[PDB]
Design an enzyme around this catalytic site. Structure first.
Site, short mmCIF file in Angstrom:
data_model
loop_
_atom_site.label_atom_id
_atom_site.label_comp_id
_atom_site.label_asym_id
_atom_site.label_seq_id
_atom_site.Cartn_x
_atom_site.Cartn_y
_atom_site.Cartn_z
N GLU A 1 39.48 18.85 -48.23
CA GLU A 1 38.45 19.88 -48.16
C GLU A 1 39.07 21.26 -48.06
OE1 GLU A 1 34.70 19.11 -45.99
OE2 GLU A 1 35.88 17.54 -45.01
N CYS B 1 28.18 12.10 -48.20
CA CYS B 1 29.09 12.07 -47.08
C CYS B 1 29.99 10.86 -47.16
CB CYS B 1 28.31 12.07 -45.78
SG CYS B 1 29.68 12.38 -44.66
#
Ligand code: HEM
Ligand code: HEM
Ligand SMILES: C[C@H](O)[C@H](O)[C@H]1CNc2nc(N)[nH]c(=O)c2N1
Ligand SMILES: C[C@H](O)[C@H](O)[C@H]1CNc2nc(N)[nH]c(=O)c2N1
Ligand SMILES: NC(=[NH2+])NCCC[C@H](N)C(=O)O
Ligand SMILES: NC(=[NH2+])NCCC[C@H](N)C(=O)O
Ligand SMILES: [Zn+2]
Lengths: 420, 420
Positions: free
Chosen positions: A295, A118
């Site tokens: 993303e 992350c």
């Protein structure tokens, strides 16, 4: 042991010591490094058919309790002992134990902080935890989830949250969401062999069709929520479309971009992972944050195994889509990512560019070493899919390791389910 | 034993068995992965002060000979066996051996084939070997190097080649080029703290200056060749300018790019490395190929620790250099890389774009698995620092391991050498 870590871009040097408290489960050996395996068995927590033997659970439970009480700037010596004692009893008399409300909140946040993949970990301490361990039916799970979605969406000002369902007891009474994400588009294998929609969800879409869902053969159809209450077969639920916030793609310069008729949802909520806390396993714990431009733009839109809209854009831009050396692919991908950021901004929805994200992670990484002297980091996952070395994380040497609490993957439910 | 790796972009899978023959020297433990360390000790091959024990060398020597004769499509049963005993006898008597001229050819090409960080390995069986083991003086080394440069530069049409200097013996009589590369710009630390030139050569240039070199305090100053023969002290040699081919930088659409007054050398020749062949070590073995656009455009020009032209170009393009979310950095990087490719094509100098590079390596990797059932690969170094996921290598799972022959790093000479 001080394993020296260095950032070749800024000269910043770190001394990692936290890697000793790591669980030695990685597959990397002295003869070969397999850090590039996407979903290794090492980061996966398989299903079980019987509760964790109290012998291996007890030491882990205590280890967690120590970490929790140790997290306090204070010293609660009494409460600490009372709890470690209380838990030991519970494990020896029930074969398991329950986390307190506050322990759960600390657990979820700490697990995020321990997610080596992350990049938005600078926010690890800012998370809204929804306690749904009292849940008992699929219908209730749906309601708990809608609560989460309505919250996190927050009229476009996305905010992180997580919903924790009852932990794993037998392994035959699992509470989990089958969907990879709370919100995701359907993938359909068309008659001509091509795939309409998201290729990544072709298999899961089939499962939905077999369960009764009626396919709409569109490019952006929101798949129904496939919920499982304690081992029972899963039941479908349709997230009310009012709760699904989407952003229509458009470019600040290329008006023809709208012609592509693209769009994407605002909420990135991973739902199929498992939370491991002091030996306990929560196979049902959907969480979310806000998106990072790349993303959607780079991965979801330009992957060959995803929407793959790259060639269409290069042509519309009038680039030399045949001469690879023209670097047409790089211009297209940039303009696409601009369309994404732009669109989210013009519609007042939270999005974060990969540059800002990277710089924030450097700040975070520094804090980790100054506080707990260590930071699990998977370089391969942290470095953005576009303009890698233009970000400081590319130049950062890092150690990757598994700690506890932690978010492990799982073998997609349907593949191992025992249907009735 | 088979380890399975998949390419998530194409779905193709491979079964790696070659990792068994790898030298277990990597520092990755079961508890933590350190695959992101730039120049780890495992990939380095330090200095000696005592020859390699013949006891220890014999296995490695035989192993290479078998690997050598194993390369031939025919069968040289007789010569093979003869060579094996010849070597055994030679190590027994002298304490070391001398690989044939043809074996050296095989070793260099094989070590290239075994370089897990080179993305251009598809050209492995295409290298010009300059045997210079007969060499004896620094002056001689220089004469050999000038041959290599003229040969490889080939007036624009770049050619791969390696120049092999005498093998290490005592470890007190090393023959090596202290320079990181044959051709490389200098870097000076100006009186106001700032850096002029290439920052990555500050320390090296300082050395040259210490050795009586006159700093020309410019930006693109070709630093002198610092050669070392028979472990003596290094002697300065200025590579004749007519041999150093340079490329003036300019954009196909941005007229103002010329005003940036940038340029770069056409010959990427790594000098400071060590070739290991059957236990033997050659601290001197400069090699070269042709540049991949991104090496100059993304790294050399845009790195903060390098020329760092990113902001200048951004302001020049009139982008929002103050709003990160505008993705001005990405647009600037692309144009700078377009300028690099353009400049080379225009000057008729050989260069390869990262897209054609990655797609060629994809083919090379497949052939390696068909052939030896393996291909050691460092994902972290293979995926281009620009538009990573737009290249197939990004989606390719891979195993990284050390074979033999191989190209190891070394400890920068000045950092260890004892001055006479
Ligand atoms: C604040 C917003 C957040 C941002 C900007 C962020 C960003 C990212 C990014 C870019 C990835 C890569 C995902 C992919 O490539 O598929 C990632 C992975 C991950 N993040 Fe975050 N994150 C955020 C919030 C969260 C939250 C709230 C949690 C958990 C409580 C979390 C847990 C993780 C985990 C475990 C992964 C791995 C996912 C996987 O392996 O597929 N992140 N994050
Ligand atoms: C045909 C042209 C070639 C291309 C396109 C190519 C390209 C590359 C690239 C892009 C890198 C990374 C450079 C960096 O980031 O520092 C690299 C590394 C490497 N290449 Fe190749 N290469 C070529 C030829 C060669 C040759 C002829 C050899 C050896 C005989 C070789 C040996 C290696 C090695 C050892 C590395 C690692 C360098 C280091 O770690 O500093 N390459 N190559
Ligand atoms: C093979 C390789 O592990 C795989 O393509 C990885 C690379 N890095 C990644 N990084 C992120 N953030 N997400 C991904 O899905 C991947 N895919
Ligand atoms: C820290 C990290 O190892 C370092 O930045 C690496 C990443 N990948 C790289 N890849 C190549 N080809 N060359 C490099 O110099 C680097 N630097
Ligand atoms: N920032 C996040 N919370 N990301 C979660 C994963 C989202 C996933 N990569 C997607 O594109 O749908
Ligand atoms: N293509 C090559 N042979 N590269 C070797 C390394 C060159 C180095 N990356 C440079 O930019 O100077
Ligand atoms: Zn590793």
């Amino acid at each position: 042991r001080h394993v020296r870590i260095k950032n070749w871009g800024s000269g910043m040097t770190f001394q990692d010591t936290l890697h000793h408290k790591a669980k030695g489960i990685l597959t990397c050996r002295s003869k070969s490094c397999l850090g590039s395996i996407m979903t290794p068995k090492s980061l996966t927590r398989g299903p079980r058919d019987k509760p964790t033997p109290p012998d291996e659970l007890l030491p882990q439970a205590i280890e967690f309790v120590n970490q929790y009480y140790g997290s306090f700037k204070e010293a609660k010596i009494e409460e600490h002992l009372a709890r470690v004692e209380a838990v030991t009893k519970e494990i020896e008399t029930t074969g398991t134990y329950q986390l307190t409300g506050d322990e759960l909140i600390f657990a979820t946040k700490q697990a995020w902080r321990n997610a080596p993949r992350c990049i938005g970990r600078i926010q690890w301490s800012n998370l809204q935890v929804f306690d749904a361990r009292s849940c008992s039916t699929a219908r209730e799970m749906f309601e708990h989830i809608c609560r989460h979605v309505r919250y996190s969406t927050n009229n476009g000002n996305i905010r992180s949250a997580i919903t924790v369902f009852p932990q794993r007891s037998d392994g035959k009474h699992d509470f989990r969401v089958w969907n990879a994400q709370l919100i995701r588009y359907a993938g359909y294998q068309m008659p001509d062999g091509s795939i309409r929609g998201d290729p990544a969800n072709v298999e899961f879409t089939q499962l939905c069709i077999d369960l009764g869902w009626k396919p709409k053969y569109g490019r952006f159809d929101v798949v129904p929520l496939v919920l499982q209450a304690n081992g029972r077969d899963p039941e479908l639920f349709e997230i009310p479309p009012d709760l699904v916030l989407e952003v229509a793609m458009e470019h600040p310069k290329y008006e023809w971009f709208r012609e592509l008729e693209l769009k994407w949802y605002a909420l990135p909520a991973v739902a199929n992972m498992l939370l491991e806390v002091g030996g306990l396993e929560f196979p049902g714990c959907p969480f979310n944050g806000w998106y990072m431009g790349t993303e959607i733009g780079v991965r979801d839109f330009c992957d060959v195994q995803r929407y793959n809209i790259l060639e269409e854009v290069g042509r519309r831009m009038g680039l030399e889509t045949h001469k690879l050396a023209s670097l047409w692919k790089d211009q297209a991908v940039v303009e696409i990512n601009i369309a994404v950021l732009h669109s989210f901004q013009k519609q007042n929805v939270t999005i974060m560019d990969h540059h800002s994200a990277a710089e924030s992670f450097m700040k975070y990484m520094q804090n980790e070493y100054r506080s707990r002297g260590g930071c699990p980091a998977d370089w391969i996952w942290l470095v953005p899919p576009m303009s890698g070395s233009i970000t400081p994380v590319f130049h950062q040497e890092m150690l990757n390791y598994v700690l506890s609490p932690f978010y492990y993957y799982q073998v997609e439910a349907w593949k191992t389910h025992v249907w009735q």
